[PDB]
Design a protein around this motif. Structure first.
Motif, mmCIF file in Angstrom:
data_model
loop_
_atom_site.group_PDB
_atom_site.id
_atom_site.type_symbol
_atom_site.label_atom_id
_atom_site.label_comp_id
_atom_site.label_asym_id
_atom_site.label_seq_id
_atom_site.Cartn_x
_atom_site.Cartn_y
_atom_site.Cartn_z
ATOM 1 N N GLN A 19 54.335 49.198 -19.857
ATOM 2 C CA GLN A 19 53.749 49.672 -18.574
ATOM 3 C C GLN A 19 54.203 48.737 -17.451
ATOM 4 O O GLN A 19 54.153 49.170 -16.250
ATOM 5 N N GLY A 23 48.989 48.612 -13.742
ATOM 6 C CA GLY A 23 47.760 48.877 -14.521
ATOM 7 C C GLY A 23 47.615 50.336 -14.887
ATOM 8 O O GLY A 23 46.596 50.998 -14.510
ATOM 9 N N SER A 24 48.632 50.856 -15.555
ATOM 10 C CA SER A 24 48.794 52.300 -15.848
ATOM 11 C C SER A 24 48.554 52.563 -17.338
ATOM 12 O O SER A 24 48.895 53.655 -17.758
ATOM 13 N N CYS A 25 47.917 51.636 -18.077
ATOM 14 C CA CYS A 25 47.605 51.794 -19.521
ATOM 15 C C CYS A 25 47.037 53.205 -19.748
ATOM 16 O O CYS A 25 47.553 53.904 -20.596
ATOM 17 N N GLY A 64 46.146 50.657 -10.322
ATOM 18 C CA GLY A 64 44.883 49.885 -10.339
ATOM 19 C C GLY A 64 43.924 50.328 -11.435
ATOM 20 O O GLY A 64 42.802 49.768 -11.473
ATOM 21 N N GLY A 65 44.341 51.264 -12.309
ATOM 22 C CA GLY A 65 43.527 51.782 -13.421
ATOM 23 C C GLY A 65 43.184 53.233 -13.201
ATOM 24 O O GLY A 65 43.605 53.800 -12.160
ATOM 25 N N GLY A 66 42.453 53.825 -14.147
ATOM 26 C CA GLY A 66 42.176 55.276 -14.151
ATOM 27 C C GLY A 66 41.535 55.703 -15.453
ATOM 28 O O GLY A 66 41.516 54.897 -16.409
ATOM 29 N N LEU A 160 34.897 47.647 -20.834
ATOM 30 C CA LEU A 160 36.205 48.314 -21.089
ATOM 31 C C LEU A 160 37.178 47.942 -19.971
ATOM 32 O O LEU A 160 36.816 48.091 -18.808
ATOM 33 N N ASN A 161 38.376 47.463 -20.302
ATOM 34 C CA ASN A 161 39.375 47.083 -19.268
ATOM 35 C C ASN A 161 40.773 47.603 -19.603
ATOM 36 O O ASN A 161 41.691 47.354 -18.802
ATOM 37 N N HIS A 162 40.954 48.298 -20.731
ATOM 38 C CA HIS A 162 42.316 48.676 -21.196
ATOM 39 C C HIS A 162 42.270 49.970 -22.013
ATOM 40 O O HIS A 162 41.334 50.103 -22.848
HETATM 41 C C1 LIG Z 1 45.219 49.515 -17.714
HETATM 42 N N1 LIG Z 1 46.365 49.036 -17.297
HETATM 43 N N2 LIG Z 1 44.076 49.439 -16.941
HETATM 44 C C2 LIG Z 1 44.109 49.045 -15.533
HETATM 45 C C3 LIG Z 1 43.905 47.533 -15.515
HETATM 46 O O1 LIG Z 1 43.916 46.895 -16.559
HETATM 47 N N3 LIG Z 1 43.646 46.945 -14.335
HETATM 48 C C4 LIG Z 1 44.618 46.995 -13.246
HETATM 49 C C5 LIG Z 1 42.371 46.265 -14.073
HETATM 50 C C6 LIG Z 1 41.145 47.162 -14.122
HETATM 51 C C7 LIG Z 1 40.457 47.365 -15.313
HETATM 52 C C8 LIG Z 1 39.306 48.141 -15.345
HETATM 53 C C9 LIG Z 1 38.826 48.719 -14.191
HETATM 54 C C10 LIG Z 1 39.491 48.525 -13.001
HETATM 55 C C11 LIG Z 1 40.637 47.740 -12.962
HETATM 56 N N4 LIG Z 1 42.853 49.600 -17.563
HETATM 57 C C12 LIG Z 1 42.085 50.667 -17.273
HETATM 58 O O2 LIG Z 1 42.444 51.641 -16.650
HETATM 59 O O3 LIG Z 1 40.904 50.470 -17.878
HETATM 60 C C13 LIG Z 1 39.943 51.562 -18.138
HETATM 61 C C14 LIG Z 1 38.821 50.903 -18.907
HETATM 62 C C15 LIG Z 1 40.584 52.669 -18.950
HETATM 63 C C16 LIG Z 1 39.471 52.044 -16.781
#
Ligand SMILES: *C(=N)N(CC(=O)N(C)Cc1ccccc1)NC(=O)OC(C)(C)C
Length: 215
Positions: A19, A23-25, A64-66, A160-162
């Protein structure tokens, strides 16, 4: 449901992606789930476009996530998603340029796994195919996984962050596990993969935000 299941052995699983610094996991996770259903229903394993989702899922935050549910909804609503070929990955966010003529899959929406239910997530993997899951991946023990059934009691199921993809489950030397495909390339973990503890009280929130596309 079977006791072990690995969808890589059925060719439902594209090569591990990276990726990058974006932050496009969630978009890799989403295209993983879609790739699985596409193979299931066509015999075609092809790379779909996370960039298409990173650019075009306005409900999500691009790099930034999703959420994956919002990914599956975009693809449903939009009435298709592009191949990686048709909409390649840049590793940074850009304007939505959905090429309709390059659409390589469709979606009738999605189902979520009941929160915290590992047995249901297992049946979903057995019945449907690869499942989009989210976890706490913020521990050093995770970031520097080599081998084994990963388990850290410091893992917070409520943080949850990933986003990742359960491509199966089984048991190695009596330890029950999830086969998790990561999107940090092949040089992370175990060839881009980790086995995470299964039926150890929802370790790292593995079943807290689990979903799959309807195909
Ligand atoms: C995956 N890459 N991702 C986004 C991320 O890790 N960032 C940029 C930080 C972040 C984490 C959680 C909430 C906001 C920002 N993770 C992601 O999308 O995490 C979930 C838990 C699927 C929202």
């Amino acid at each position: 449901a079977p006791d072990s299941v690995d969808y890589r052995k059925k060719g439902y699983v594209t090569p591990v992606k990276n990726q990058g610094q974006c932050g496009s996991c969630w978009a890799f996770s989403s295209v993983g789930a879609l790739e699985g259903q596409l193979k299931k229903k066509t015999g075609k394993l092809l790379n779909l476009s996370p960039q298409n989702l990173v650019d075009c899922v306005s409900e999500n935050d691009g790099c930034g996530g999703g959420y994956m549910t919002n990914a599956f909804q975009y693809v449903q609503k939009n009435r298709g998603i592009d191949s990686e070929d048709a909409y390649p990955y840049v590793g940074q966010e850009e304007s939505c340029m959905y090429n309709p003529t390059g659409k390589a899959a469709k979606c009738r929406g999605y189902r979520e796994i009941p929160e915290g239910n590992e047995k249901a997530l297992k049946r979903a993997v057995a019945r449907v195919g690869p499942v989009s899951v989210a976890i706490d991946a913020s521990l050093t023990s995770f970031q520097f996984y080599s081998k084994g059934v990963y388990y850290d009691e410091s893992c917070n199921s409520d943080n949850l962050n990933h986003a990742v993809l359960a491509v199966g489950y089984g048991i190695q030397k009596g330890n029950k596990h999830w086969i998790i495909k990561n999107s940090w390339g092949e040089n992370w973990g175990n060839k881009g993969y980790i086995l995470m503890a299964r039926n150890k009280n929802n370790a790292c929130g593995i079943a807290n935000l689990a979903s799959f596309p309807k195909m």
